[PDB]
Amino acid sequence: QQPWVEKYRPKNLDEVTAQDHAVTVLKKTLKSANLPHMLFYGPPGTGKTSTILALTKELYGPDLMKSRILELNASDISIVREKVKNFARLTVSKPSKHDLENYPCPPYKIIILDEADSMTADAQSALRRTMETYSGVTRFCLICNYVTRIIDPLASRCSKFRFKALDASNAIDRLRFISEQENVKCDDGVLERILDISAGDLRRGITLLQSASKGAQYLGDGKNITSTQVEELAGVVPHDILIEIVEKVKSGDFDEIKKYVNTFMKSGWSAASVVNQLHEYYITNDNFDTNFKNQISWLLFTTDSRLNNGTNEHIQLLNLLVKISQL
Amino acid sequence: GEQWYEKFKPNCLEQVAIHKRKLKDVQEALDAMFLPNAKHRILLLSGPSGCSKSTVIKELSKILVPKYRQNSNEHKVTEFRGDCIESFSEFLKGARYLVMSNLSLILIEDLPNVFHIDTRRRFQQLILQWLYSSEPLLPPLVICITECEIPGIDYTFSAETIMNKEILMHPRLKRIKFNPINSTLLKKHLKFICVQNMKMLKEKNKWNKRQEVIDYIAQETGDIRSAITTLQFWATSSGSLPESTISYFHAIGKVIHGSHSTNNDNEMINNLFENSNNLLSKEDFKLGILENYNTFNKGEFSISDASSIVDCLSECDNMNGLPESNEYGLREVRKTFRNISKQGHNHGTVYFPREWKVRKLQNSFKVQAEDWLNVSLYKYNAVHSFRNITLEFGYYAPLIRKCQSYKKKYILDKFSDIMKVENGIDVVDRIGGPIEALSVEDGLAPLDHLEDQKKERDRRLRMLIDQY
Amino acid sequence: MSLWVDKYRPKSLNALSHNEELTNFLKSLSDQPRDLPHLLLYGPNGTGKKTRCMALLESIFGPGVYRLKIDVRQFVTASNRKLELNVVSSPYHLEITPSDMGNNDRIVIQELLKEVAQMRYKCVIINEANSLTKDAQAALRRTMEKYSKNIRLIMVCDSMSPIIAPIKSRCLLIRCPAPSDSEISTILSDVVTNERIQLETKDILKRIAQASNGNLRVSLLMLESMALNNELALKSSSPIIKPDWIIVIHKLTRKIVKERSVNSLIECRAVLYDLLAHCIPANIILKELTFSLLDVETLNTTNKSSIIEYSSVFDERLSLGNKAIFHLEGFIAKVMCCLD
Amino acid sequence: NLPWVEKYRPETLDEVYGQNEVITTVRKFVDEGKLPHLLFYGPPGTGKTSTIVALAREIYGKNYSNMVLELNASDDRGIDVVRNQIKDFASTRQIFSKGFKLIILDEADAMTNAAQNALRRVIERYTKNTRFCVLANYAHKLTPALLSRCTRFRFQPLPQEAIERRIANVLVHEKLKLSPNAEKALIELSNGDMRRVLNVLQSCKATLDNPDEDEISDDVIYECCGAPRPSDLKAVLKSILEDDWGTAHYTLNKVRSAKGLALIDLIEGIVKILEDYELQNEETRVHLLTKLADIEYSISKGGNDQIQGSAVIGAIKASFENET
Amino acid sequence: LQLPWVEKYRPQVLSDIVGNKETIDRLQQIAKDGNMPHMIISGMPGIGKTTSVHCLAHELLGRSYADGVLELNASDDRGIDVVRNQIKHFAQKKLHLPPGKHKIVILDEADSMTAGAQQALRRTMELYSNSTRFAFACNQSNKIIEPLQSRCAILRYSKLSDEDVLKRLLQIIKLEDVKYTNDGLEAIIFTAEGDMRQAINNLQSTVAGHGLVNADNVFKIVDSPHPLIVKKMLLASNLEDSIQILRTDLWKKGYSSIDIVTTSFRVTKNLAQVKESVRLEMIKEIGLTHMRILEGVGTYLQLASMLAKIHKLNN
Ligand SMILES: Nc1ncnc2c1ncn2[C@@H]1O[C@H](COP(=O)(O)OP(=O)(O)OP(=O)(O)O)[C@@H](O)[C@H]1O
Ligand SMILES: Nc1ncnc2c1ncn2[C@@H]1O[C@H](COP(=O)(O)OP(=O)(O)O)[C@@H](O)[C@H]1O
Ligand SMILES: Nc1ncnc2c1ncn2[C@@H]1O[C@H](COP(=O)(O)OP(=O)(O)O)[C@@H](O)[C@H]1O
Ligand SMILES: Nc1ncnc2c1ncn2[C@@H]1O[C@H](COP(=O)(O)OP(=O)(O)O)[C@@H](O)[C@H]1O
Ligand SMILES: Nc1ncnc2c1ncn2[C@@H]1O[C@H](COP(=O)(O)OP(=O)(O)O)[C@@H](O)[C@H]1O
Ligand SMILES: [Mg+2]
């Protein structure tokens, strides 16, 4: 059919919730009839892409927009530079009578570079040069998460828009509305569990909800979503297994920890998820003193760094558990 | 000042440096070409330098052109130059008239500026038009191409890149590939040039030691012109003219055993690095150290020093070939071995790394695994991954097949499936051989059975296809 | 005839016997072929992920995917070099293992996927997806974004961590836990009944399953080897045939524990070259050596902790290294020093 | 209108300040009028382009348009296009035929070696007709041949007083108000580069609602430059040093999420702030530097962000434990 | 306006040439033999390759040097056809010479050009082979196609080393009447890195811009990181002083991290008081920092960590 992320995207600017300041500034700029280079930044899944798409749809119109809007991920510099140059150099098509009747179609095109913060300094300098070359007819909208990763020369050329993190109420209401519209039956705590797993990212939450709905449809039972299915889809280890791991670590016996790790590795659960869950459990616990947390932070950091390099999960997990047991 | 090869260029067809097979094939093809209703208009020779491509053509033409010339000399080969200062088209049009009584072989060794795409397109179009010409009477066209590359047209200038597919697979174009001159013919020609220069050789007293150098020349390259030039240079030069293993031995000994002329480690390290950078740049040096450090004091030192040396070598390997990595590794090795040196040096035999043998064994194992996979697919409809073959099916399946074959032989429906094993097309020996140990490569062995193994695998694949 | 490992391999979703929930999920998924998503099965090696993929493909496209053919499709690398990678193909699907290439796996994936798309849909099975390079994963992301309609991906992996986040988001994650000892014993008993192998006691199957360590493939291989070696009559005292390289690693562990000397180090290094010459991955050798050392009953807690530290450090070194011999020798030397 | 970089570009050599040595060295060329090949190198935003343009204007006069061709080595078009343009400009007969022709090439250091040999060849071909002033940042990355074919001129960093007076000049010609803290922050961020100073000032003026009656603040400058605010970094450091784990973790996450501050930037800012701290034990600095460098290296390759932040907090706390 | 110093007084005979003594002896024996085959010269430029060829021409021809030598860049006009035309015009010119001696043509920079035109040059040499002998200059011997190296003889050169660089600098200063000091010559040699052309250019620039040739004066013109500053930073007893030096004299001056680490490694390679263990530990730390920088993290914190590790090592 279609992913629910794009299907339920906000249509107009007024449909964006909990973004009063940025939305108001964007409406003021739209009324001014002068669109400068835009740099949207904020935590993921807050509507930056939705806000920019709504702004374009209110500028060119539903039909004309497809001709004046380009989207690129800015990942992996020659290729993206060539595509941007080709899109910008192309002559703007002629607006139709209906487009001009109700939309004040500006005489320029918009290119949206998502994940702009992932670019390197040289790539950002090349992008700045391209912007300067084609500033007259092209307006850029760089979507990112951290504004500090953009080089100062490039950042100074764009008006900045900060997006605040969505509150739990707005996200839960949005998920509930989507579920009712799509006829999704979920047990109490399922939506909150999805939000917790997604860490407030509505994109990931909606994707997980769609996956859980598909799984329930496949199941053929009452189709009442349960937190266990959500965790299984998200790859989150069950909390009970984490509790047993913590108890074994507290025991301190090397042989028992080794046997438990050997048994666990047969389950197929990822070691990275276990490391993240252990970090969350230990860092946010009031039963451990300052020195214990000082040591556990470094131990977890070292284990995560070793895992990220493509190392054997079994050995790294066993070493981490042995180290924690010895603290 | 005059050059030897120009002085002693071949005069007949018997002194041409080329194998008899290629000479006969070229002669037969050229003779059949001269026939009125010929099948090929362009003869394309393509091969490496110094293969007597144009020389053989000229020698054959000297005798062949008069045979087919019609009633109405020295115009046997109207060669075209690529630096004449559209010329190729004019040359082709002019040669078109060179028929009947104006017969003259055409030779295109020198090629025009074909670097730009437009020039290559023009050349290809002209060749296609010549091949498509309906003129029953046309002059011979011969194109000689020398293959060279520097690892597109820029990368290589072989035949494949010079003309398009339509000309490469043209039904009416004969392509011949030459081979470098063999050692025997080159030696014979060099000794003939000697026999000619006996006078000056005796005057210089180099006749007694010529055989000591000629072989080397014959073993250097198969280029007749280059070999003759080298022989002339050696005969003219009054000095002595012409390693890596000796340098490797000295470097390894200095790194491990240490130098005696200089007592300063830093000075020795800096001088060795400055004098020999290419030798230490290669990764193998590190491996050599790992293979030679144990030789110090015939292995009579504490395990702590060996552990430190190996840890440093691993750290240097992780540095990914940086200039500081080799410096650090060598300085650790020298410092560690200097702290436990008793009085002097025990220069034990230097062993080269075993990595190359391991790589060859791995290649053989991969070939055997591919053969086993093909056999399994074509005899049991089973597909297995390479990792599974290396870990699981490398040992279990050969043992099972060997046991089944032994039972089948002993017997000749409890064992009905057992006797179904076909000895010819079933692997019964563990892939890669027994896992016992690998010995040190004391011998030089700077470096094939892989080609034979691949041929055997192809034969088995064909047999399975016939069965399937 | 065909090996018992392949002879009794399930050929349908109804022939499965372990992980009934996963079987029901696969049956439900096959009931609607049109909306089949991109699947990522992750789990331990030898559990039966490939068998489940084959069963699902048979249920969707019918009993025709089991007829496989091998084709050698050659391509050109970036440096104008001729590369060859074999492809296993069926009339309705194809199987590829880009890990066999290495760093230059993106080109092969791109070319194969584009060619398949150009020609309802076809199923591409990416074997060993966890070992794919990051750029290869990005190319896969591009193909999923573009050619989702015509190409459906079913990727089987030993570990799920290496997979990049976007691929996880765009794909349906399915965990494949290893079979329990009881289920392995039941399968081996069924094979015994179908093969007429006399058993003095039923504990032989349990011991074989325990030795296999959850690997059904290896368990079946041991069962067949022991049955053939014991005149098709197993006994409680019949030895368990383990992989030869495993026994070599055990001998190496015993030698390291007993003799801690430079000459012993050289002999162990030679054994390491011999093991590597048989294409055994360095990481697997390190893991097996470390776990064999940890199983020694004469070592105290401090020695075990030091051994596991050194194993982790040298595994990280292997991941970022080029030559495996250096790191393996360093780990062995460190273990010898700590023990001595 | 025109960007402030070129709007306030010096018109004469007498308007170039902070480079008195090179200015007096080149004041002879305008008098004599014979211009050889030149190579201006130095840190960016020091007046190399301004100096060469002023000298060309003073020498040629009204013929600047037809006797001065300005090109950038990092143009969007291929470097072959730049070579073709140079060839066309040099070969074409001089319309006025008075003196040599000047080609001001900028960002020459960014070229590859082969491009530099090509530029040297082009310089050799048209020595009698074309004069080249190669503008770069550092001379050491240029090939020795090109360096030999050109006369070197080094531009020293602009004095801080010169930047102060130029900023005052811009703020008086342009009806703009800048607070002392904002100007100090702008100078610190620029690091002596006048291009960035002018660009940031123009952007800040643009962002102002009413530029006639509004004053720029340090917060505005930081927002325009997109750099970490010192106040946020100091607050995070204080929370890490004088609060429990829960409070420090919450503060770090809140600041990073609500200010768009990357972990690497936060680490660099904290290191810069701590370099001014007066520590008792010298091992604390070593531990801080090593652990933070390791964390930054790990972050560069990706991983878990929460674990990295907790590692930063724990490293700082453990290192500062040595103080007592 | 004024011509470069290096070109003003280029060596005229092989005796003045220094470095690669075996190759010089081979050139001398070839010259006295009177028969000169084809050459393929390889090596990093600036070590008297072309100058050695012209000196060999001097020793061989003598009075007919200007009438029997042609130096061609092979890419000045961006065309091989014009190069072939020039070669034809030169070789085809009829000039009577004594028996044995042959005209010399130098084709500089043959490594930045494609294989097909290498074959074209081989054909040109083959056609004009009894009158002209070619000396192909290149930076890599393997890059040249196999037929070319088979036809010609390879001459491998290397760097001139600090001793000979200093020697030539002493003669240049003696003839130039330049006031110099030992530290200035040491700085010039350090910046040259074995390149004679770079050393002469640096000396000329220092003499022009400034007066007495001192290390400070030399590096006022070179612009590279000052070795004495890097040495003081590395050997500073207190960590805070080293950090301050790195921040002020190096980081705020715009010097890149890669240049700083390269200079630190070069300085560490040559030290006196540092023990061998300390020297090699410092080399290891510098190498790790270089590896980290090359992978993308070219930040100041890496340099600070390197300095901290070095200071810890000195304790
Ligand atoms: N015995 C010989 N056999 C062949 N060529 C010889 C012999 N003696 C001297 N030569 C000379 O060596 C050269 C080799 O012949 P030819 O040039 O035709 O071959 P080639 O490999 O096609 O050449 P190229 O590389 O120039 O295209 C010619 O100059 C030939 O005159
Ligand atoms: N402010 C908002 N109001 C309504 N929906 C939102 C908002 N922010 C995010 N969403 C929802 O999240 C989904 C994905 O948003 P996403 O594109 O990830 O935003 P961003 O690119 O800013 O992270 C959308 O389908 C949208 O419905
Ligand atoms: N449910 C099952 N019942 C019986 N045998 C099975 C089952 N699952 C797997 N096997 C056996 O395991 C062997 C290998 O399984 P495989 O598909 O390689 O697992 P993986 O994909 O995890 O490597 C097969 O030969 C098959 O006979
Ligand atoms: N020496 C100087 N004197 C006065 N202003 C300068 C000087 N150098 C730079 N500037 C100012 O910096 C701005 C840009 O200078 P720029 O052309 O980038 O110099 P460079 O090319 O040396 O970087 C100009 O508008 C100018 O006002
Ligand atoms: N040993 C030397 N003695 C004196 N001058 C040298 C020496 N080596 C190089 N040079 C100088 O370098 C310049 C060119 O030398 P060379 O390296 O042969 O050519 P290229 O620099 O084009 O490779 C000459 O002008 C010469 O003065
Ligand atoms: Mg020939």
DSSP B252-317: HHHHHT--SS---HHHHHHHHHHH-SHHHHSTHHHHHHHHHGGGGGGG-S-HHHHHHHHHHHHHHH
Do B378 and B433 lie in one domain? The reply is yes
Question: Both ends of chain D: CA-CA distance in Å?
Answer: 59
Size of interface B-E (CB pairs under 8 A): 130
| Token pair listed for E281 | 């530990």
CA dihedral D313, D314, D315, D316 (to 10 degrees): 50
CB pair distance less than 8 Å for D271 and E254:
no
Q: Does residue B288 contact residue B353 with C-beta atoms inside 8 Å?
A: yes
Atom of ligand 1 nearest to the CA of E126: 26
Q: Does A156 touch chain D (CB under 8 A)?
A: yes
Chain D residues in contact with A279 (beta carbon < 8 A): 304, 306-307, 310
Structural domain tally of chain A? 3
Residue linked to tokens 């091969």: B47
Beta strand residue intervals within B48-187, DSSP E: 106-107, 141-146, 173-177
Give the integer Cα–Cα distance in Å for E284 and B319.
Answer: 9
- Distance in Å from the first CA to the final CA of chain C: 52
Give which of A42, A14, A2 is closest to A161, Cα–Cα: A42
Domain assignment present for residue B8? The answer is no
Which tokens go with D229?
């605010």
Structure tokens at E75: 């890419």
C272 CB less than 6 Å from ligand 3? no
* A95's tokens: 């607006």
Q: Which of B353, B350, B352, B355 is nearest to B256 (CA)?
A: B350
Place of tokens 């700029």: A29
CA-based end-to-end distance of chain A: 52
* Ligand 1 within 6 A of CB of B221: no
Q: Are strands C151-157 and C172-175 parallel, antiparallel or unpaired?
A: unpaired
Give, in order, the Cα–Cα distances in Å from B79 to each of A222, B105, B129. Answer: 90, 9, 20
**Phi-psi map region of B380: left, alpha, beta (phi>0 left; psi -120 to 50 alpha):** alpha
Residue B42 pairs with which residues in a beta bridge? B141, B173
Strands (E) in A78-193, as ranges, are: 109-113, 138-144, 159-162
CB of C186 closer than 6 angstroms to any ligand 3 atom: no
Q: Which residues contact E215 (CB under 8 A, 6 or more apart)?
A: E183, E184, E186, E187, E226, E227, E228
Q: What is the largest CA-CA distance in chain B?
A: 97
Minimum CA–CA partner of D144 in chain E? E198
3-state secondary structure (DSSP) of residue A29: helix
What the block records as the tokens of A157 is 């050329």
Q: How far apart are CA D141 and CA E221, in angstroms?
A: 14
Distance of CA E8 to the CA centre of its chain: 18
B294 and C CB contact within 8 Å: yes
Phi, psi of B366 (to 5 degrees): -65, -40
Sign of CA dihedral D105, D111, D113, D115: negative
Q: How far apart are CA A157 and CA D207, in angstroms?
A: 11
Please indicate, yes or no, whether residues A11 and A80 belong to a single structural domain of this protein.
Answer: yes
Residue D310: CB partners within 8 Å, gap ≥ 6? A279, A283, A297, A300, A301, D249
Q: With contact defined as beta carbons under 8 Å apart, do E39 and E157 qualify?
A: no
∠ CA C285-C290-C294 to the nearest 5 degrees?
150
Q: Is the dihedral of CA D104, D109, D110, D114 positive or negative?
A: positive
Give chain E's radius of gyration (CA, Å). Answer: 24
CB within 8 Å: E291 and B113:
no
C-beta separation of A23 from A42 below 8 A? no
CA-closest candidate to residue B122, choices B144, B81, B89: B89
Q: Look at residue D176 and give its three-state secondary structure.
A: coil
Please give the structure tokens belonging to residue A35.
Answer: 């669109």
Closest CA to A308 of C316, C256, E216, C210: C316
- In C163-192, the residues whose Cβ lies within 8 Å of chain A are 168-169, 172-173, 175-178
Rounded Cα–Cα distance for residues A270 and A308 (Å): 12
Q: Do A220 and C28 touch (CB under 8 A)?
A: yes
B100 and B158 within one domain = yes
Interface touch D271/E304, C-beta < 8 Å: yes
Query: Token digits for C50?
Result: 């490939």
The token pair that represents C129 in the structure block? 């997806």
Asked whether residue A194 falls in the same domain as residue A146, the answer is: no
| Interface contact E312-D286, CB threshold 8 A | yes
D267 interaction partners in chain E (CB closer than 8 Å): 301
- Per-domain residue ranges for chain C? 4-175, 181-234, 244-339
User: What token pair was written down for B273?
Assistant: 């690095």
Query: D49 C-alpha to center of ligand 4: Å?
Result: 7
Radius of gyration of chain A (CA): 24
**CA–CA separation, B300 and D161 (whole Å):** 70
Q: Reduced to 3 states, what is the DSSP secondary structure of residue C173?
A: strand
Task: Examine residue B349 and state whether it is found in any structural domain, yes or no.
Answer: no
Q: Which residue of E has its CA nearest to B112?
A: E120
Third-level CATH fold of C181-234:
Helicase, Ruva Protein; domain 3 (1.10.8)
Residue where a domain terminates, one of A133, A166, A199: A166
Distance CA C97, CA C82 (A): 18
Spatial separation of the C-alpha atoms in residues C194 and E171, rounded to whole Å: 97
Cβ partners under 8 Å of residue C77, min gap 6: C83, C104, C107
Dihedral Cα B264, B268, B269, B271, nearest 10 deg: 140
Going by their DSSP bridges, the two strands C82-89 and C93-96 should be labelled as antiparallel
Q: Which residue has the tokens 């060839």?
A: D87
Tokens for B143?
Answer: 């194109």
From residue E273, alpha-carbon distances to B295, E10, E235, E241, E279 in Å are: 32, 40, 10, 20, 9
The residue behind tokens 């090349």 is A126
Cα distance between residue B314 and residue C317, in whole Å: 8
Gaps in chain B with C–N over 2.5 Å, residue before each: 72, 85, 151, 242, 412, 447
- Other beta carbons within 10 angstroms of residue E279's beta carbon come to 23
Residues 6+ apart with CB under 8 A from B154: E114, E115, E116
Number of domains in chain B: 4
CATH code: domain of residue B129: 3.40.50.300
The one-character DSSP state at D31 is H
Backbone torsion region of residue C233, taken as left when φ is above 0, otherwise alpha when ψ lies between -120 and 50, otherwise beta: beta
Residue ranges of domains in chain E: 1-160, 161-224, 225-315
Q: Within this chain, do residues A117 and A210 fall inside the same structural domain, yes or no?
A: no
What is the maximum alpha-carbon separation in chain D?
A: 79
Neighbours of ion ligand 6 (CB under 5 A): B 54
Sign (positive or negative) of CA dihedral B384, B388, B389, B395:
negative
Q: Which tokens belong to A256?
A: 């028992």
Kindly compute the dihedral angle of the four CA atoms of residues C109, C115, C117, C120, in this order, to the nearest 10 degrees.
-110
Q: Enumerate the β-bridge partners of residue C127.
A: C156
In sequence order, which ranges of E34-77 are alpha helices (DSSP H)? 49-60
If asked whether residues B198 and B66 sit together in one domain, one would say no
Residue B360 sits in the same domain as residue B430: yes
Type of residue found at D102: L
CB E279 within 8 A of CB E271: yes
Q: In terms of CATH, what superfamily is C4-175?
A: P-loop containing nucleotide triphosphate hydrolases (3.40.50.300)
Q: Give the neighbor-by-neighbor strand order of the sheet with E39-42.
A: E69-72, E103-107, E132-138, E39-42, E153-156
Which amino acid is it at C215? N
Query: How many angstroms does the Cα of residue D46 sit away from the middle of ligand 4?
Result: 5
Name the amino acid, one letter, at C62.
Answer: G
Domain that holds residue A190: 167-236
Q: Resolution in angstroms, to 1 decimal, for this deposition? A: 2.7
- Closest partner CB to B154 (pick from E114, E129, E284): E114
Residue B347 maps to a domain: no
A10 and A95 inside one domain:
yes
How far does CA A303 lie from the centroid of its chain?
A: 24
Q: D283-295 b/e with 16+ CB inside 10 Å = b?
A: ebbbbbbbbbbbb
Burial pattern B220-258, b for ≥16 Cβ within 10 A else e, equals ebbbbbbbbbbbbbbbeeeeeeeeeeeebbebbbbbbbb
Burial degree of E140 (CB within 10 A; 0-12, 13-18, 19+): exposed
Q: How far is E34 from chain B (nearest CA, A)?
A: 9
Instruction: Please report which ligand is nearest the Cα atom of B188.
Output: 1
Tell whether B273 and B223 lie within a shared domain. no
Find all residues with CB under 8 Å of C84, minimum gap 6, and list them: C72, C73, C74, C75
Burial class (CB in 10 A: 0-12, 13-18, 19+), D180: exposed
CA C75 to chain B, closest CA, distance in angstroms equals 16
- Give the dihedral sign, CA B408/B413/B414/B418: positive
The backbone region for E194, taken as left when phi is positive above 0, alpha when psi lies in -120 to 50, beta otherwise, is left
Whether C151 contacts C143, CB under 8 Å: yes
CA distance C98 to C126: 7
The total number of residues shown for chain E amounts to 315
Inter-residue contact E48 to E27 (CB < 8 Å): no
Is B392 an 8 Å CB contact of chain C? yes
**CA-based nearest residue to C241, from C283, C278, C211:** C211
Contact B303 C336 (CB under 8 A): yes
The residue behind tokens 């349908």 is C12
Residue with tokens 């006829």: A183
The closest alpha carbon to E9, from E169, E234, E230, belongs to: E169
Q: Is E194 annotated as a binding residue?
A: no
Angle made by CA atoms D135, D141, D147, in degrees to the nearest 5: 60
In the block, residue with structure tokens 């104006």: B102
Three-state secondary structure readout of B79-117: CCCCCCCCHHHHHHHHHHHCCHHHCCEEECCCCCCCCCH
What is residue B143's three-state secondary structure?
strand
**Are A40 and A52 found together in one domain?**
yes
Q: Give the whole-angstrom CA distance, residue E130 versus residue B3.
A: 7
Q: What is the DSSP letter of E103?
A: E
- Do B266 and B325 share a domain, yes or no? yes
Please, what sign has the CA dihedral across residues E270, E273, E274, E277? positive
Residue where a domain terminates, one of B177, B205, B223: B177
Cβ partners under 8 Å of residue D213, min gap 6 = none
Within a domain: B9: no
Token pair, residue B419, equals 């006797």
Instruction: Indicate if A75 and A130 belong to the same structural domain.
Output: yes
- On whether the CB atoms of residues A255 and A321 are closer than 8 A, the answer is no
For residues B149 and B213, membership in a common domain is answered with: no
Integer-rounded Cα radius of gyration of chain C: 23
Q: Nearest CA to B237 among E42, E22, E101, E27? A: E27
DSSP result, D205-259:
HHHSSSTTT-EE-HHHHHHHHT---HHHHHHHHHHHHHS-HHHHHHHHHHHHHHH
> How far is it, in rounded angstroms, from Cα B15 to Cα B55?
11
**The two structure tokens encoding residue D185:** 């922050």
E129 phi, psi to nearest 5 deg? -120, -20
Phi, psi angles (nearest 5°) of residue E85: -65, -45
Q: Where are the alpha helices (DSSP H) in chain C?
A: 4-7, 20-30, 49-61, 106-118, 134-146, 165-170, 181-195, 203-212, 216-229, 244-258, 262-277, 282-294, 301-320, 324-339
Beta-sheet pairing, E103-107 with A138-144: unpaired
Closest to C324 measured CA to CA, from E92, A50, B359, B244? B359
Report how far residue E18's alpha carbon sits from residue E48's, in angstroms, rounded to the nearest whole number.
Answer: 8
Cβ neighbors of D230 (< 8 A, separation 6 or more) are D269, D273
Q: Which tokens hold the place of A300?
A: 């977890």
Please name the residues in contact with E272: beta carbons below 8 A apart, sequence gap of 6 or more.
Answer: none
Nearest-CB residue to B153 (from E116, E161, E291): E116
Looking at the partner chain, which of C44, C286, C316 has a beta carbon nearest the beta carbon of A266? C44
Distance of CA C44 to the CA centre of its chain: 7
Which numbered atom of ligand 2 lies nearest the CA of A45?
23
Q: Are both A230 and A138 inside the same structural domain?
A: no
Of D227, D260, D301, nearest to A162 by CB-CB distance is D260
CATH architecture of C244-339: Up-down Bundle (1.20)
SS3 of residue B32 by DSSP? helix
Q: Which of A166, A185, A207 is the last residue of a domain?
A: A166
Mutate to test the interface with E, among D86, D160, D286, D300 (most CBs of E within 10 A): D286
Kindly state whether C304 is in contact with chain A, defined as any CB-CB distance less than 8 angstroms: yes
D76 touches chain A (CB under 8 A): yes
